[PDB]
Design a protein around this nucleic acid. Structure first.
Ligand SMILES: [Mg+2]
Ligand SMILES: [Zn+2]
Ligand SMILES: [Zn+2]
Ligand SMILES: [Zn+2]
Lengths: 145, 578, 83, 199, 123, 95, 568, 99
DNA sequence: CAAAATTTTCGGAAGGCATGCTCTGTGGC
DNA sequence: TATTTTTTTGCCTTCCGAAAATTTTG
RNA sequence: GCCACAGAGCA
């Protein structure tokens, strides 16, 4: 085991969520799939889920973590409802602004609606953006693109 | 979560790097220092003694004790080393000739090699060629030694160098002594060392004239301590010309002089139990180790309390002889020791001969799943078939792994049991580690619960590949591969067309039957060592498996010109051959 | 970089006896560990005879990597080799 | 938060898995070896993303399993420095507070030095108090949603002890270890702490 | 037996142990307390070791992440250290094969250290 | 083949063969082993005898080649997957 | 209680006892001052002798050609690597790199060198020349060799530049700074081999002289050319240049100056002789001897004759010629002989000489003559009389006495005064028996046996076995004892080298263990404010670490005072 | 063991080993002389070459370089005997697969 | 040129080595 | 304690004075 | 049980 490169690419939470939901659909790991025949149905024979418990546990934990809302008054995280077209639109909107790759990645991962959260993600907001640009960015992130 | 990724890579052996252990390497691998002569303490029902030659930390010799280092029984313990510090250094009997060769190439006054820088550079250039093999290296080193012997006086100092040799070249303590004749090449040129020598002897002869007769034989002796201190100040750049690689810390001449003796694990010198319970016989290595401890303690106590110098040197020589017998018992006469006769089995005696490690346990060794039986003829067998007795086939087993293609067969074999011949003797489950005997189980629940990865040791049945061997193996056809048939008459049976490669005749001959336990070995035996694929000897390509006596004569009588058969006799003969 | 291309293969195209023995042993060991077979086995249970039937009509998925003394090797498909 | 790591590995496919597709078998072996495990000096691996190059399967003499040299990109959980993240408080100590990312990684510790200024811990209520203003009735209650900022990524060795020191320790236990991956949170900026506080 | 014969000086009680220590017990007289002249000599040693440690000829042992942040500005550079090819070499003292790595046509700066007058070792 | 007539003896094999364990297993075991230890020679495990002694496959007969199982993975099946964030993000507007 | 082999391998120096003292010392010094790459190169050169760049690349794992070339440049600038360029018969040219003890000893003696420079030129009066001399010598030692123009390019004050130039001239006049050249980078043996072969070829072919006559003539020509080449550094050829403004002597600008190790070792030998004379003849007479040795120090004979390292001692006649030449140069050198009048001008004001002598039971010439006659009439040959009133130091006859005295007193301090008595007893009558020792040296027989058994372990006493049987049995043979000087001196030199190397290894291990705290404490803002900016526990650890480092360096200096006598 | 009175096994001597060598059957020789007689799983250190116990090297005092291998027990016995004779047969290991 | 140091030759002593496997019985600590 | 036999044969190299031969000094 | 010794089998 050798690590050719520590960082090959950056993954947003949307990409990981979509990939793991596709993996759960492929391996029949979704809550609907287990509710169908895994429990409370007799005809579970000849159709079996993927046996690996460790991967199933970690993918369930990750999908539960990325599914719930990290930024709310207290139910969905928004990236679950987001699609490829909305992601591309959000990329096109945020690329026009005066932001770095890490800041854009954190904006995608967390999707702020609170104002102080957007203060926290990008540092020296007052020394880089005026109130109009900050309000425009908050409007862009508000609709989840 | 928190587990770290483990990566195990399969590996083989690329090579071996022979060397000698330094003091730090000997102590580092040690687990206890042997500092007690007594093997057992009489106050604890003859338990092994702490810091002794049979210390438990060095392993266990019985099946009831614990190692107290790895906490394992006799089966699961690899053995651990101890170390023993000698009071004074002694010469290594194995490296004695190497020590003499090193001393013959260095100045005995400043430990510098007796070579000019031009010759040194030329010999290093010869030694560092890309294509140098062992023979060329030994030749270059011999030339270096011969050139060093010709150097009458050193280069860095003006010291006179004589000839370094053994004291007597025999089989006693004098055979383990090095003398340096300094004034053998002096001639009549009035060397300044000769003036000091004659001044010394004039000064000492005024008090003891009786020594005057012994002045001629008096030479500069090289005791192990002086040799060690001389080796300690050898420049590392000159070690390559003496045959030693100085790039590693263990590549120094002083490594080849005994300072720390590695006491071997007791798993390689076990105490042999006898028929008498209170007493257990000990290996010769352990007794010699205790003797070495006793002599070194005696030497140290004599150094501390100031015993006479003759006794000191005598006990030093006794320690040298004891370590020499501990390594090679045939090197020195046991009668020279005060205690002493059958010579002990040293480490050299365990490695050489037909009964040693190499020719008795490494090149050839006892194998399992083999049988030996008298042979008798059987013409009805095919030439690639040997008949095994039913009794032998119930002992020699083949481990078949349960697959999707042979589950029912192995279930039937498990049900049949160890007594009925088409059966099995042992079963090893996939998740288990110890095979279970089928002579005690239910034998019906085991068959029903036969998994898809279990290994069942079934009896030798028909079609099994067996190696058939006659012990005077002269050519490769003396061991072949046959298909097993099972017959009830307590003898091996092979076709008489096959007894010619074996050089075997049925007048009391016994042959051996090996059963390969691996699919790869089975396939290799049946495809490369088969009787069908070995019908021609590789000596000349001529057939070796063909008609023998009583088959040539019958064929000649059939094919004789006055042999006429009607249809009844013809048809009977044709049914007889098929 | 040590792989000789298929066009410039210089070793013999015939399967040696050692290659046959090693191939049969490897396939028998694989079958003994519950590998799928590509033949219509007629009640055979021994892995060796199944491997022999597999080699009989060239239905075995292995290649021979023949190592030249210099270091370069040479990949030959078993079905390509002549037996 | 999540990055892609390119790793070369040697996978052992057993001969009973030959009926499966080779990509699926390689991915299954890689998930046995790597999933939900700590890659040293890299982080925590989630799932094998994809395979880039696959070599020919080499066979060891004496085993029918096929060994394949496979290069793969895998999704590994590596929060970079300065990235903020939301977790749930599991337990609070005198030295600091412990937060878990909902079962993914329960090894995040926020100490006193990087926490809110003036915070103090009192055992009876089991929470940390931050005197921000006159309305200082704010508690770092357990099982609550906190936001923090990653400041240090610490790796320690998984070096085992001596054998004898292992049986004696096991015998004493019969009669806590440093995690190989850990992160240190911080609360040195407004907006960290409880998410409901900055509503 | 190998055990019967004993030297005259020794007895049975004092032999059979073989405890040779691994630790020496004969010290040189150089281990006395330090003096003022020796203290000045020692701080001269320390100063020379430090000034060779950070000099142009060190050749030492044989978090810079690729991520880009706005904190890169307002962050100063560590040090513009002197390299092996930034020294006024006397080319008559060196072999011809070493000319490639010394930068024969480059900027030449002589790194001259300043002597520390006080014994700045904290006691 | 070494330039001279060696002979099939202990002395001849001591010059022909540079392996240590092969010579040690024939004759003069202790002398050869101690000479190897003193001269610190490296013995490559390539001969049949030391392969038997160490218990691994010899390089003659069935060990002169390596059996390789040809994987059926095409290049088309090994295309990199979609990495949306690193592709759609650009830093043209800083700089 | 019992100590495990784990504890022995951990807390003791058993792993370091298996290392050659030369290699261990050189590698430790280079790793302490330079980096680990230079340490690897120096260690490989010590282990394998001379090597090429390609051989160093192929022998050391983890270094390529450029890295090896860079570290060879770094070592060559500090004069830690000698080199020789040689051409093969086929025409290929190869550079072979050696190791020289000169640069490693410069690294080892650096603070002692700075202290000797500071003390020797009598700048003890005030402070600014203390600063300038210390900084220029430290820069010269640290950079290996530097030019004066490049040094003065960093100074902007004209008066400071003038004082620095004058101090450089003062250093060059008294021999401490010399001109570096390819002579200091070529081996002595290779130079003598080249000269001998050149003078052998210049002998005409078919000469009437035989082979031995040709060899003798070539040896004579090689010896005179070698003497000229060796003494060429010391002719003051770099100082003859005068500045464009008159009445000022300056060192040449483009010349490269280097520190002279031979002059420093001459000073160390003078200090050792003063310390030896302080134990035999008074304290005022010791001061007179000190002034005499400081005066006749620059022109004194070198510590080691380079011709002795050329491999020429295999001929006994060459050994006698070297001894006679040494006895000639120590006497007939014009600057070595001195009178009382010569020493009268160099006496200090504090020295009185007035009431120091009693004839029967102000810097005058008679009192100095009386003191020098006390020095010359002592048992140790501190001074000798050629003609009456003229004195010279007998360096050929005084230095074995110094070596023997230092060796005997080291044995006295370590193994006891009885060890001194036994060693000197065995030395005085050369070959002795146990009974003759007991009669001649009056002490108990068991004490004699124990003491000689202890002395045998350190090569002090060698056992001569005289056998009285056909087989050399220890019971029937008779054992005499002799004392060989060279074996014991070499053994103790190696022992002191190992102790110095082990001390440096312990210091480096301590610094590597406390590296974080030492890096924190040595920062620019932290320094000078350690009490304010550091915790009390870190302050106490820094206290202990610095005290231990100072003790290590003090013990190193004391060892160096005890080890250079056997390098004489 | 030796002899049918101690339920012993038959000896595959030098001549039979050499005949199997002449046939070219490497796997059969490995099975007969290692698998069926004295196979032994041992710890080998990759740095110092010496063998260890329980996944631990007593010389380096670390478990980083321990590798599981299978050798004949006679080889381990020979290595320990040589180590008792001041000979160090340090094994050097390499990967089976070229990678 | 003949003494004298050096190199090569020539004997005699000293170790090392000598088929494979297999089966019993007896004796001594 | 001291009288006192061998119980295969052939081949081989290394060591080491002794002696012959050659070189080298004076 | 260990160690030697002795005999025997097959070319
Ligand atoms: Mg017969
Ligand atoms: Zn154990
Ligand atoms: Zn010498
Ligand atoms: Zn190790």
């Amino acid at each position: 085991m050798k690590v050719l490169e520590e960082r090959n690419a950056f993954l947003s939470d949307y990409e990981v969520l979509k990939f793991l939901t596709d993996l759960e659909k492929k391996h029949l790991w979704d809550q609907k799939s287990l509710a169908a025949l895994k429990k409370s149905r007799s005809k579970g024979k000849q159709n079996r889920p993927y046996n690996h418990p460790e991967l199933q546990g970690i993918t369930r934990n990750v999908v539960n973590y990325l599914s719930i809302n990290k930024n709310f008054i207290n139910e969905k995280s928004g990236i679950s409802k987001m699609s490829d077209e909305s992601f591309a639109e959000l990329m096109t909107k945020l690329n026009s602004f005066k932001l770095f790759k890490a800041e854009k990645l954190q904006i995608v991962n967390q999707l702020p609606a609170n104002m102080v959260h957007l203060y926290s993600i990008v540092e020296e907001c007052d020394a880089r953006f005026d109130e109009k640009t900050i309000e425009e960015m908050l409007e862009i992130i508000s609709g989840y693109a | 979560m928190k587990e770290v990724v483990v990566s195990e890579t399969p590996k083989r052996i690329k090579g071996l790097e022979f060397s000698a252990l330094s003091a730090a390497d000997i102590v580092a691998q040690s687990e206890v220092e042997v500092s007690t002569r007594d093997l057992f303490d009489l106050e604890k029902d003859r338990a092994p003694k702490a810091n002794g030659a049979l210390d438990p930390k060095m392993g266990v010799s019985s099946s009831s004790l614990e190692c107290a280092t790895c906490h394992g029984n006799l089966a699961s313990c690899h053995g651990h080393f101890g170390h023993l510090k000698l009071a004074l250094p002694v010469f290594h009997i194995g490296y004695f000739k190497a020590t003499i060769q090193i001393l013959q190439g260095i100045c005995k006054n400043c430990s510098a090699i007796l070579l000019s820088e031009t010759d040194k550079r030329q010999f290093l250039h010869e030694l560092r060629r890309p294509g140098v093999d062992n023979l060329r290296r030994m030749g270059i080193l011999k030339k270096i030694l011969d050139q060093c012997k010709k150097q009458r006086r050193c280069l860095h100092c003006g010291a006179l160098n004589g000839v370094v040799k053994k004291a007597a070249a025999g089989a006693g303590s004098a055979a383990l002594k090095i003398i340096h004749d300094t004034f053998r090449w002096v001639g009549k040129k009035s060397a300044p060392e000769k003036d000091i020598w004659v001044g010394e002897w004039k000064e000492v002869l005024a008090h003891n004239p009786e020594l005057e007769r012994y002045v001629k034989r008096c030479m500069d002796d090289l005791n192990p301590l002086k040799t060690l201190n001389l080796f300690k100040q050898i420049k590392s750049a000159d070690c390559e010309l003496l045959g030693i690689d100085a790039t590693v810390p263990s590549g120094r001449p002083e490594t080849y002089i005994w300072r720390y003796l590695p006491a071997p694990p007791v798993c390689i010198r076990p105490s042999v139990m006898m028929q008498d319970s209170p007493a257990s016989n000990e290996d010769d290595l352990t007794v010699k180790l205790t003797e070495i401890v006793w002599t070194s303690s005696l030497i140290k106590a004599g150094l501390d309390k100031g015993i006479s110098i003759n006794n000191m040197m005598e006990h030093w020589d006794y320690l040298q002889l004891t370590v020499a017998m501990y390594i090679n018992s045939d090197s020195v006469n046991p009668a020279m020791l005060p205690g002493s006769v059958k010579p002990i089995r040293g480490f050299c005696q365990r490695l050489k001969g037909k009964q040693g490690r190499f020719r008795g346990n490494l090149s050839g060794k006892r194998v399992d799943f083999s049988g030996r039986t008298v042979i008798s003829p059987d013409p009805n067998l095919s030439i690639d078939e040997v008949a095994v007795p039913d009794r032998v086939a119930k002992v020699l087993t083949y481990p078949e792994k349960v697959t999707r293609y042979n589950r029912h067969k192995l279930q039937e074999l498990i049900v049949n049991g160890p007594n009925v011949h088409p059966g099995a003797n042992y079963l090893l489950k996939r998740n288990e580690d110890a095979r279970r005997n089928l002579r005690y189980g239910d034998r019906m629940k085991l068959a029903k619960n036969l998994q898809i990865g279990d290994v069942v040791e079934r009896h030798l049945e028909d079609g099994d590949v067996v190696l058939f061997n006659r012990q005077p193996s002269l050519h490769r056809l003396s061991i072949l591969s046959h298909y097993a048939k099972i017959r009830p008459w307590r003898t091996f049976r092979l076709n008489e067309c096959v007894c010619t490669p074996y050089n075997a005749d049925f007048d009391g001959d016994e042959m051996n039957l090996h059963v390969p336990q691996t699919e790869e070995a089975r396939a290799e035996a049946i495809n490369l060592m088969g009787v069908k694929n070995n019908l021609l000897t590789p000596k000349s390509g001529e057939p070796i498996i063909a008609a023998t006596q009583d088959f040539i004569t019958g064929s000649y009588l059939i094919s004789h010109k006055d042999s006429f058969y009607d249809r009844a006799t013809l048809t009977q003969l044709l049914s007889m051959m098929s | 970089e040590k792989a000789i291309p298929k066009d410039q293969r210089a070793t013999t195209p015939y399967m040696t006896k050692y290659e046959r023995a090693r191939i049969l042993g490897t396939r028998a060991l694989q079958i003994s560990m519950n590998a799928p077979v590509f033949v219509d086995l007629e009640g055979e249970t021994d892995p060796l005879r199944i491997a022999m039937k597999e080699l009989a009509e060239k239905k075995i998925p292995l290649v021979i990597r023949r190592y030249l003394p210099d270091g370069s090797f040479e990949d030959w498909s078993v079905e390509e080799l002549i037996v | 938060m999540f990055i892609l790591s390119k790793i070369a590995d040697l996978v052992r496919i057993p001969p009973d898995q030959f009926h499966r597709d080779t990509i699926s078998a390689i991915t299954h072996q890689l998930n046995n070896k790597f999933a939900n495990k700590i890659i040293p000096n890299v982080g925590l691996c989630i799932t094998i993303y994809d395979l880039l190059t696959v070599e020919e399967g080499q066979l060891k003499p004496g085993d029918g399993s096929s060994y394949i040299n496979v290069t793969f990109r895998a999704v590994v959980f590596k929060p970079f420095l300065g990235e903020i993240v939301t977790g749930w408080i599991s337990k609070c100590t005198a030295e600091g507070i412990k937060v878990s990312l909902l079962g993914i990684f329960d090894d995040i510790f926020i100490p006193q030095n990087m926490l809110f200024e003036g915070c103090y811990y009192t055992p009876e209520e089991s929470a940390w108090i931050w005197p921000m203003d006159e309305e200082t009735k704010l508690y770092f209650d357990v099982n609550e949603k906190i936001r923090f900022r990653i400041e240090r990524e610490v790796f320690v060795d998984v070096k085992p002890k001596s054998p004898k020191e292992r049986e004696l320790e096991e015998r004493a236990q019969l009669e806590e270890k440093p995690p190989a991956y850990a992160l240190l949170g911080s609360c040195q900026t407004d907006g960290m702490g409880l998410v409901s506080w900055w509503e | 037996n190998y055990m019967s014969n004993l030297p005259f000086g020794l007895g049975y009680g004092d032999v059979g142990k073989n405890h040779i220590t691994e630790f020496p017990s004969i010290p040189l007289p150089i281990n006395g307390p330090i003096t003022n002249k020796e203290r000045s000599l020692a701080v001269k040693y320390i100063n020379f070791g430090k000034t060779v440690k950070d000099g142009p000829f060190y050749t030492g042992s044989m978090t810079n992440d690729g991520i880009e942040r706005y904190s890169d500005k307002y962050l100063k550079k560590r040090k513009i250290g002197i390299s092996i090819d930034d020294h006024p070499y006397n080319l008559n003292l060196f072999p011809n094969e070493l000319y490639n790595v010394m930068g024969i046509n480059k900027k030449k700066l002589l790194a001259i250290s300043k002597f520390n007058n006080a014994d700045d070792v904290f006691t | 083949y070494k330039g001279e007539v060696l002979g099939i003896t202990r002395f001849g094999l001591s010059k022909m063969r540079d392996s240590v364990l092969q010579l040690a297993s024939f004759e003069k075991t202790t002398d050869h082993l101690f000479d190897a230890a003193f001269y610190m020679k490296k013995d490559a495990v390539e001969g049949v005898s030391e392969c038997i002694i160490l218990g691994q496959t010899m390089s003659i007969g069935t060990g002169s080649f390596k059996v390789v199982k040809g994987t059926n993975i095409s290049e088309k099946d090994l295309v990199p997957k979609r990495c949306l964030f690193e592709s759609l993000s650009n830093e043209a507007a800083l700089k | 209680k019992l100590v495990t082999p784990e504890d022995v391998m951990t807390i003791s120096s058993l792993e370091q006892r298996t290392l050659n003292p030369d290699l261990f010392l050189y590698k430790e010094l280079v790793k302490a001052h330079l980096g680990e790459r230079a340490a690897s190169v120096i260690g490989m050169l010590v282990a394998l002798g001379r090597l090429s760049v390609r051989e160093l690349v192929e022998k050391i794992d983890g270094m390529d050609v450029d890295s090896v070339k860079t570290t060879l440049v770094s070592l060559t600038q500090l004069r830690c690597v000698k080199y020789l360029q040689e051409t093969a018969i086929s025409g290929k040219k190869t550079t072979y790199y050696y190791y020289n003890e000169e640069g490693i000893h410069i690294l080892l003696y650096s603070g002692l060198i700075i202290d000797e420079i500071i003390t020797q030129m009598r700048v003890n009066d005030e402070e600014e020349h203390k600063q300038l001399v210390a900084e220029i010598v430290q820069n010269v030692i640290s950079l290996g060799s530097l030019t004066v123009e490049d040094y003065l390019s960093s100074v902007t004050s004209d008066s400071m530049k003038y004082t620095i130039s004058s101090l450089f001239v003062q250093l060059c006049e008294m021999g401490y700074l010399i001109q570096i050249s390819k002579l200091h980078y070529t081996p002595i043996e290779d130079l003598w081999q080249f000269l001998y072969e050149k003078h052998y070829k210049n002998i005409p072919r078919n000469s009437p002289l035989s082979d031995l006559k040709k060899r003798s003539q070539a040896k004579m020509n090689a010896k005179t050319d070698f003497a000229k080449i060796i003494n060429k550094p010391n002719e003051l050829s770099q100082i003859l240049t005068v500045d464009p403004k008159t009445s000022l002597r300056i060192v040449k600008p483009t010349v490269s100056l280097t520190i002279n190790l031979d002059r420093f070792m001459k000073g160390r030998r003078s200090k050792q002789l003063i310390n030896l004379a302080k134990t035999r003849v008074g304290s005022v007479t010791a001061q007179v001897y000190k002034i005499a040795l400081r005066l006749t120090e620059q022109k004194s004979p070198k510590i080691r004759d380079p011709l002795t390292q050329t491999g020429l001692l295999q001929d006994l006649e060459e050994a006698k010629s070297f001894q006679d030449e040494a006895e000639l140069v120590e006497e007939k050198t014009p600057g070595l002989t001195f009178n009382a009048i010569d020493l009268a001008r160099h006496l200090p004001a504090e020295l009185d000489l007035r009431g120091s002598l009693l004839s029967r039971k102000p810097h005058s010439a008679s009192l100095i003559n009386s003191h020098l006659k006390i020095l010359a009439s002592s048992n140790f040959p501190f001074l000798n009389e050629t003609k009456p009133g003229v004195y010279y130091v007998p360096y050929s006859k005084l230095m074995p006495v110094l070596k023997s005295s230092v060796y005997e007193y080291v044995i006295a301090s370590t193994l006891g005064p009885s060890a001194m008595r036994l060693s000197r007893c065995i030395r005085d009558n050369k070959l002795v028996s146990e009974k003759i020792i007991n009669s001649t040296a009056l002490m108990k027989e068991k004490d004699i046996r124990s003491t000689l058994a202890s002395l045998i372990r350190y090569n002090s006493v060698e056992i001569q076995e005289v056998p009285r049987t056909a087989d050399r049995s220890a019971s029937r043979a008779v054992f005499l004892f002799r004392c060989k000087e060279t074996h014991s001196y070499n053994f103790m030199r190696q022992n002191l080298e190992w102790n110095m190397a082990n001390l440096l290894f312990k210091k480096e291990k301590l610094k590597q263990e406390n590296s974080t705290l030492l890096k924190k404490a040595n920062r620019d803002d932290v320094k000078g404010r350690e009490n304010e900016l550091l915790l009390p526990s870190e302050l106490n650890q820094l206290k202990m670490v610095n005290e231990r480092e100072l003790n290590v360096f003090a013990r190193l200096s004391r060892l160096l005072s005890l080890w250079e006598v056997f390098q004489m | 063991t030796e002899g049918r009175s101690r339920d012993g096994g038959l000896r595959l001597g030098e001549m039979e080993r050499d005949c199997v060598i002449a046939y070219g059957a490497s796997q059969l020789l490995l099975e007969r002389l290692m698998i069926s007689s004295d196979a032994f799983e041992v710890d080998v250190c990759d740095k110092c070459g010496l063998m260890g116990y329980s996944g631990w090297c007593t010389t380096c005092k670390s478990a980083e370089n321990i590798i599981k291998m299978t050798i004949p027990y006679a080889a381990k016995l020979l290595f320990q005997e040589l180590l008792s004779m001041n000979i160090a047969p340090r094994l050097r290991l390499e990967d089976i697969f070229q990678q």
